[PDB]
Amino acid sequence: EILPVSMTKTSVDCTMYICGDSTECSNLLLQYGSFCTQLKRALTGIAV
């Protein structure tokens, strides 16, 4: 009787994924609020 127990833990850097080391892209993303913070919090919760 087989049963899955765990999932692979992953974390994603929001800024580097959305913006490829572009200063203008980072400046534009700065106006979108704390979405990346929420994503990071959710991923850390999943890992723990």
């Binding site: 609020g33 704390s34 913070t37 929420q38 919090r41």
Partner: protein, 48 residues
């Protein structure tokens, strides 16, 4: 019926120890505080 007195004393000591452990250790109720903090964080992000 043979060890009524001993069993009653053990139960009383155990309940007293439970009371003291709840009184002393402040992190026993971690899950309830975690739920409250999660809701507060969600609301704070939404307003901010």
């Amino acid at each position: 019926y043979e060890n009524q007195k001993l069993i009653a004393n053990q139960f009383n000591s155990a309940i007293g120890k439970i009371q003291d452990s709840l009184f002393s250790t402040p992190s026993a109720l971690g899950k309830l505080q975690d739920v409250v903090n999660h809701n507060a964080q969600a609301l704070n992000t939404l307003v901010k």
